[PDB]
Amino acid sequence: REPMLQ
Amino acid sequence: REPMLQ
Amino acid sequence: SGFRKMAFPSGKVEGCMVQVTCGTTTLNGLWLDDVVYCPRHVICTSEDMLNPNYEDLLIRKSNHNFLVQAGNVQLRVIGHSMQNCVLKLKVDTANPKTPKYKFVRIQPGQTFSVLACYNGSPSGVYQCAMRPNFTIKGSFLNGSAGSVGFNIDYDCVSFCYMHHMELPTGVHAGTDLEGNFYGPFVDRQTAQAAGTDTTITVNVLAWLYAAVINGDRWFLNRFTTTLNDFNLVAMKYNYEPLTQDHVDILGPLSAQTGIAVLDMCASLKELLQNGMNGRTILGSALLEDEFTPFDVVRQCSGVTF
Amino acid sequence: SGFRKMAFPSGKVEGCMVQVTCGTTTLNGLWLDDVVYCPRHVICTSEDMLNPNYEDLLIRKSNHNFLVQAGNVQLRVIGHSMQNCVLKLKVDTANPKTPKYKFVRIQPGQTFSVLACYNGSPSGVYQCAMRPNFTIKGSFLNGSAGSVGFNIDYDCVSFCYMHHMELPTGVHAGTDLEGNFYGPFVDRQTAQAAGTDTTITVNVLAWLYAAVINGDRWFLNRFTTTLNDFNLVAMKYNYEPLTQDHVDILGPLSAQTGIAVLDMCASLKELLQNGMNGRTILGSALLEDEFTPFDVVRQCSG
Numbered sequence: 009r010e011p012m013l014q
Numbered sequence: 015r016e017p018m019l020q
Numbered sequence: 021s022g023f024r025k026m027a028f029p030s031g032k033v034e035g036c037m038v039q040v041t042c043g044t045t046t047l048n049g050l051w052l053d054d055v056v057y058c059p060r061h062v063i064c065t066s067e068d069m070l071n072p073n074y075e076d077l078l079i080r081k082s083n084h085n086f087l088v089q090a091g092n093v094q095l096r097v098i099g100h101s102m103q104n105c106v107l108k109l110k111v112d113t114a115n116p117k118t119p120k121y122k123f124v125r126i127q128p129g130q131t132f133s134v135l136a137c138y139n140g141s142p143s144g145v146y147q148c149a150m151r152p153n154f155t156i157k158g159s160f161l162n163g164s165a166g167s168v169g170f171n172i173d174y175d176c177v178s179f180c181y182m183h184h185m186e187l188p189t190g191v192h193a194g195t196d197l198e199g200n201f202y203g204p205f206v207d208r209q210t211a212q213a214a215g216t217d218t219t220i221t222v223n224v225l226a227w228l229y230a231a232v233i234n235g236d237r238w239f240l241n242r243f244t245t246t247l248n249d250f251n252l253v254a255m256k257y258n259y260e261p262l263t264q265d266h267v268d269i270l271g272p273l274s275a276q277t278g279i280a281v282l283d284m285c286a287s288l289k290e291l292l293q294n295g296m297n298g299r300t301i302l303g304s305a306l307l308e309d310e311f312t313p314f315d316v317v318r319q320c321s322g323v324t325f
Numbered sequence: 326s327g328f329r330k331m332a333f334p335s336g337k338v339e340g341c342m343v344q345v346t347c348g349t350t351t352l353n354g355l356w357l358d359d360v361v362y363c364p365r366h367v368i369c370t371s372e373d374m375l376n377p378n379y380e381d382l383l384i385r386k387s388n389h390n391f392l393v394q395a396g397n398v399q400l401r402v403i404g405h406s407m408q409n410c411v412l413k414l415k416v417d418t419a420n421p422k423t424p425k426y427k428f429v430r431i432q433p434g435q436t437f438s439v440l441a442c443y444n445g446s447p448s449g450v451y452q453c454a455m456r457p458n459f460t461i462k463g464s465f466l467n468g469s470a471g472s473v474g475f476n477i478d479y480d481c482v483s484f485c486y487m488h489h490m491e492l493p494t495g496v497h498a499g500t501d502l503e504g505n506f507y508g509p510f511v512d513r514q515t516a517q518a519a520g521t522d523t524t525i526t527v528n529v530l531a532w533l534y535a536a537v538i539n540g541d542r543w544f545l546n547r548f549t550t551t552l553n554d555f556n557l558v559a560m561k562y563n564y565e566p567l568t569q570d571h572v573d574i575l576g577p578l579s580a581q582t583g584i585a586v587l588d589m590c591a592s593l594k595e596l597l598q599n600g601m602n603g604r605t606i607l608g609s610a611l612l613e614d615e616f617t618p619f620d621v622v623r624q625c626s627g
Contacts, residue, residue, distance in 0.1 A: 026451045030336060190539060319449070324447060
């Protein structure tokens, strides 16, 4: 998956 | 051990 | 993503905590409107804790015998009465920090947050469940009595527990906010023991649903089961039998995931009979039973207070 | 008695949480005195998340592009700057409920309380440890960025974490309050992965001591070990080397229980080489490593 900025 | 009122 | 044992924010309850000193002993009270709720054994000395006659210890005390401090301010007690196992100390000042609140008596298998307090100062917050045997697996030291357990619904604090004692096995017992003990215990240092406990099946099932929501699903299988056939397995492993209300309560999670409750019971059956074989679920090697279905939905949807 | 994952009371931090919106993206800010600290990726659109140049994005912003809401009140932003990966929005009113506080950068192995928040409002609190690989194992959804981690001593809140992002394996990453990330991570959605992790040996030992204080003793044994013999086994199981500073920090718990640190190491050695045989310690079938020695002393009796 991609990293996710939350 | 006896019950302890805290 | 992720799934943690999460407590409610404690801010609204912190402002209700006060210290009650009745001579030499000190414990915590809960200040709502113009009443301070505290365990009655604040009036005892250590020589009285065995078999106190609370009615006779009370009459020796008058209003001025109760020292109530809310931080840097002292609250004048202008009245005192006993309701079951709590005292109600009327004060001359209604707590300006009183939240919207309810007093509720909870059922075994339901959870709540505890704000552990000492000398009227909060010290910690953690999540508990009322065990089927009516004890709670808390963390409490001498002086913690009067700490409270609660849930929040929107902006309303539902107080369900006030702490009173520790049992010989290291578990804990207390009352609702009307002073009635959970379970058959008494605020006495006589011989007492918690009865047999069981695992809260419907909570284990909710937690397995939480696992699936979060992508932890190795325990899913192509099998199914009837409720009665599952409950035979449940009792074999000292799990609470599943009643169809439990099944109903799991309805929202089953609909969210598309996994029939009885199919998830089939996964739980295989877990009980074959263990986890060194695998983990949501980071745990044991089957966690202190998340309710409401807890799961609350966390996984980001509800705020 | 008893032993639980215990967070600090969250009230003082609840009173500092605000919502920050720049365009269509919203997250949380921390409002202390007249400054609001928040993650810089609040200036990004959903397309600026892959490889943002934050300098470019920020210079294109004005003060009025930042909407700050404290409860149902709008705070006026009157100045902004970027410090590493956080923004500092100066507002026109100081938070009147600002607690005594400090900013600290914690060490892998230390713990803190997280107040998970959405739209400037709190959802819940839980304990986290900073893993050796600079991740934390939290419970964070979109919108949670800007939630903070902290420790409370007396009534001084030591802020040590601000949440930014979720890595692919589902662990979480963020910065200190000065905007420097914990770990080699960057606030972009380019490919990244957490490094290999290890178990925090000193914390497992502290947790064993907690069990002894709470009357669990089945794992104790008559054996002893040297620090070097123990560390040879430790490495074999992905455990951090135990140092003399770690032995020293376990002093109080050793004294209270009367079990030498190296005797507890022998206990842990036998647990690692033989497992637990379906038994449990403090309600856990795994060796817990997210309690510090300080967490044990704070919770347990003396």
